[PDB]
Design an enzyme around this catalytic site. Structure first.
Site, PDB file in Angstrom:
ATOM      1  N   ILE A  10       0.847  -1.178   0.000  1.00  0.00           N
ATOM      2  CA  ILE A  10       0.000   0.000   0.000  1.00  0.00           C
ATOM      3  C   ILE A  10       0.894   1.244   0.000  1.00  0.00           C
ATOM      4  CG2 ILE A  10      -1.396   1.391   1.548  1.00  0.00           C
ATOM      5  CD1 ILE A  10      -2.873  -1.067   2.324  1.00  0.00           C
ATOM      6  N   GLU A  12       4.871   3.268   1.815  1.00  0.00           N
ATOM      7  CA  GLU A  12       5.864   3.567   2.835  1.00  0.00           C
ATOM      8  C   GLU A  12       5.270   4.603   3.783  1.00  0.00           C
ATOM      9  OE1 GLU A  12       9.199   2.155   1.316  1.00  0.00           O
ATOM     10  OE2 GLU A  12       7.773   1.572  -0.241  1.00  0.00           O
ATOM     11  N   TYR A  15       6.914   5.061   9.874  1.00  0.00           N
ATOM     12  CA  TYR A  15       7.589   3.970  10.610  1.00  0.00           C
ATOM     13  C   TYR A  15       7.858   2.653   9.852  1.00  0.00           C
ATOM     14  CZ  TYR A  15       5.920   7.133  14.161  1.00  0.00           C
ATOM     15  OH  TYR A  15       5.635   8.332  14.771  1.00  0.00           O
ATOM     16  N   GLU A  69      -7.546  -2.485  10.439  1.00  0.00           N
ATOM     17  CA  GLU A  69      -8.605  -2.413   9.438  1.00  0.00           C
ATOM     18  C   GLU A  69      -8.096  -1.782   8.133  1.00  0.00           C
ATOM     19  OE1 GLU A  69     -12.637   0.075   8.915  1.00  0.00           O
ATOM     20  OE2 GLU A  69     -11.572   0.577  10.778  1.00  0.00           O
ATOM     21  N   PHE A  70      -8.673  -2.212   7.027  1.00  0.00           N
ATOM     22  CA  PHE A  70      -8.252  -1.729   5.732  1.00  0.00           C
ATOM     23  C   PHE A  70      -9.239  -0.709   5.163  1.00  0.00           C
ATOM     24  CE2 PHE A  70      -8.092  -2.049   1.096  1.00  0.00           C
ATOM     25  CZ  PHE A  70      -6.795  -1.684   0.928  1.00  0.00           C
ATOM     26  N   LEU A  71      -8.718   0.446   4.761  1.00  0.00           N
ATOM     27  CA  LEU A  71      -9.518   1.447   4.076  1.00  0.00           C
ATOM     28  C   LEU A  71      -8.994   1.623   2.677  1.00  0.00           C
ATOM     29  CD1 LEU A  71      -9.726   2.795   7.245  1.00  0.00           C
ATOM     30  CD2 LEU A  71     -11.206   4.220   5.911  1.00  0.00           C
ATOM     31  N   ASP A  74      -6.849   7.160   0.743  1.00  0.00           N
ATOM     32  CA  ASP A  74      -6.526   8.218   1.689  1.00  0.00           C
ATOM     33  C   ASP A  74      -6.941   9.592   1.191  1.00  0.00           C
ATOM     34  OD1 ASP A  74      -3.275   7.768   0.540  1.00  0.00           O
ATOM     35  OD2 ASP A  74      -4.246   9.729   0.384  1.00  0.00           O
ATOM     36  N   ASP A 115       0.589  14.380  14.729  1.00  0.00           N
ATOM     37  CA  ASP A 115       1.170  14.412  13.367  1.00  0.00           C
ATOM     38  C   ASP A 115       0.114  14.179  12.267  1.00  0.00           C
ATOM     39  OD1 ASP A 115       3.118  14.565  11.339  1.00  0.00           O
ATOM     40  OD2 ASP A 115       3.515  12.407  11.481  1.00  0.00           O
ATOM     41  N   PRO A 118      -3.137  15.059   5.489  1.00  0.00           N
ATOM     42  CA  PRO A 118      -4.109  14.408   4.607  1.00  0.00           C
ATOM     43  C   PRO A 118      -3.816  12.919   4.397  1.00  0.00           C
ATOM     44  CG  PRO A 118      -3.444  16.486   3.686  1.00  0.00           C
ATOM     45  CD  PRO A 118      -2.568  16.263   4.873  1.00  0.00           C
TER      46      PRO A 118
HETATM   47  C1  LIG Z   1      -0.850   6.089   7.869  1.00  0.00           C
HETATM   48  C2  LIG Z   1      -0.418   6.246   6.399  1.00  0.00           C
HETATM   49  C3  LIG Z   1      -0.327   4.948   5.565  1.00  0.00           C
HETATM   50  C4  LIG Z   1       0.923   4.983   4.684  1.00  0.00           C
HETATM   51  O1  LIG Z   1       1.165   6.281   4.084  1.00  0.00           O
HETATM   52  N1  LIG Z   1      -1.575   4.804   4.680  1.00  0.00           N
HETATM   53  C5  LIG Z   1      -2.570   3.907   4.628  1.00  0.00           C
HETATM   54  N2  LIG Z   1      -3.415   3.694   3.585  1.00  0.00           N
HETATM   55  C6  LIG Z   1      -4.429   2.773   3.586  1.00  0.00           C
HETATM   56  N3  LIG Z   1      -5.196   2.700   2.513  1.00  0.00           N
HETATM   57  C7  LIG Z   1      -4.764   3.555   1.391  1.00  0.00           C
HETATM   58  C8  LIG Z   1      -4.681   2.654   0.144  1.00  0.00           C
HETATM   59  C9  LIG Z   1      -5.606   1.628  -0.011  1.00  0.00           C
HETATM   60  C10 LIG Z   1      -5.543   0.808  -1.132  1.00  0.00           C
HETATM   61  C11 LIG Z   1      -4.543   1.047  -2.067  1.00  0.00           C
HETATM   62  C12 LIG Z   1      -3.619   2.082  -1.939  1.00  0.00           C
HETATM   63  C13 LIG Z   1      -3.700   2.891  -0.812  1.00  0.00           C
HETATM   64  C14 LIG Z   1      -4.558   2.023   4.790  1.00  0.00           C
HETATM   65  N4  LIG Z   1      -5.428   1.042   5.251  1.00  0.00           N
HETATM   66  C15 LIG Z   1      -5.065   0.747   6.477  1.00  0.00           C
HETATM   67  N5  LIG Z   1      -3.985   1.486   6.884  1.00  0.00           N
HETATM   68  C16 LIG Z   1      -3.261   1.536   8.162  1.00  0.00           C
HETATM   69  C17 LIG Z   1      -1.759   1.255   7.906  1.00  0.00           C
HETATM   70  C18 LIG Z   1      -3.447   2.931   8.806  1.00  0.00           C
HETATM   71  C19 LIG Z   1      -3.677   2.278   5.807  1.00  0.00           C
HETATM   72  N6  LIG Z   1      -2.693   3.201   5.746  1.00  0.00           N
END
Ligand SMILES: CC[C@H](CO)Nc1nc(NCc2ccccc2)c2ncn(C(C)C)c2n1
Length: 286
Positions: A10, A12, A15, A69-71, A74, A115, A118
């Site tokens: 997804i 970098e 951390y 959880e997966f979203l 962003d 911190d 967007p």
């Molecule tokens: C906290 C910032 C992190 C990395 O820049 N972004 C991100 N992005 C997520 N989804 C953005 C994304 C979803 C599908 C494909 C590309 C990017 C996401 N889902 C769960 N998480 C956890 C790690 C907080 C996700 N984190």
């Protein structure tokens, strides 16, 4: 780790790498961060609808994986997709409403993010937005350059942090959100600093250079200098067109220099700007 087939990088983060992963016990797609333990184990317990659920914490063979959880998207990506039209205001209003709900929840357990930006604001197809990486900066760091030597942005930093206060409060989060709020409206970063003194000075040129009248005790802060240039505050009507009178009163209240004077998250949910909130679904394809 073994219970997870990762199915994508997804991104970098600050951390570690984040992977979309298929937990193959539960069968569930999940976001896997590869990175204190008392602290991040505390977080498992603070769940809100607008806070990205920390499912597990895996400290196996002395490494750290955090299973969230997966979203799907962003906020930063979504602001770039919506660049020529802008995000519609009912959407901006509802996202701000939800975020202040999440902030109001963590702030009452006395967890700060500290911190916000967007990039760790994550949205789904329903019309929801969540806060990601809450409680981690306390647990480790908030550094200057990430693990891949990316410079961590200063654009959203509260000016008392920049001026060397070490006992930030929850107010540093309401500052950042004012910055993200203004940016959703203008389609343009409020305070795009590229160094700490550039960041300080960018704030000063717009809000005016702080003194003892508006900010009690600023002149004895660690990194305050008497030699700071004295700039004059600007009209918010020039700073955030075409935001209405309600939005701007709110925005200036989140951008108060004195942290004691700055609006709390719970109080922002009661501001007249939010009288007409709805929950719209956004235009987003995956
Ligand atoms: C906290 C910032 C992190 C990395 O820049 N972004 C991100 N992005 C997520 N989804 C953005 C994304 C979803 C599908 C494909 C590309 C990017 C996401 N889902 C769960 N998480 C956890 C790690 C907080 C996700 N984190």
């Amino acid at each position: 780790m073994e219970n997870f087939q990762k199915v994508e990088k997804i991104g970098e983060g600050t951390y570690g790498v984040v992977y979309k992963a298929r937990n193959k016990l539960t069968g569930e797609v999940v976001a896997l961060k590869k990175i204190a333990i008392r602290e991040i184990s505390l977080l498992k317990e603070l769940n809100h609808p607008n806070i990205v659920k920390l499912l597990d914490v895996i400290h196996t063979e002395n490494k750290l994986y955090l299973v969230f959880e997966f979203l799907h998207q962003d906020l930063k990506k979504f602001m770039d997709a919506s660049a020529l039209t802008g995000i519609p205001l009912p959407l901006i209003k509802s996202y701000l409403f939800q975020l202040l709900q999440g902030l109001a929840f963590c702030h009452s357990h006395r967890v700060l993010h500290r911190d916000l930006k967007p990039q760790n604001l994550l949205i789904n197809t329903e019309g929801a937005i969540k806060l990601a990486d809450f409680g981690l900066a306390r647990a480790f760091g908030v550094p200057v350059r990430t693990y891949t030597h990316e410079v961590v942005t200063l654009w959203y930093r509260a000016p008392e942090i920049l001026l060397g206060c070490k006992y930030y409060s929850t107010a540093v989060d309401i500052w950042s959100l004012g910055c993200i709020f203004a940016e959703m409206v203008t389609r343009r970063a409020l305070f795009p600093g590229d160094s700490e003194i550039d960041q300080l000075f960018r704030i000063f040129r717009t809000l005016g250079t702080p003194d003892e009248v508006v900010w009690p005790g600023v002149t004895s802060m660690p990194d305050y200098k008497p030699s700071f240039p004295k700039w004059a505050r600007q009209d918010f009507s020039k700073v955030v067109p075409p935001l209405d009178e309600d939005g701007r009163s709110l925005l200036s209240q989140m951008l108060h220099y004195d942290p004691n004077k700055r609006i709390s998250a719970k109080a922002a949910l009661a501001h007249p700007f939010f009288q007409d909130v709805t929950k719209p679904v956004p235009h987003l394809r995956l």
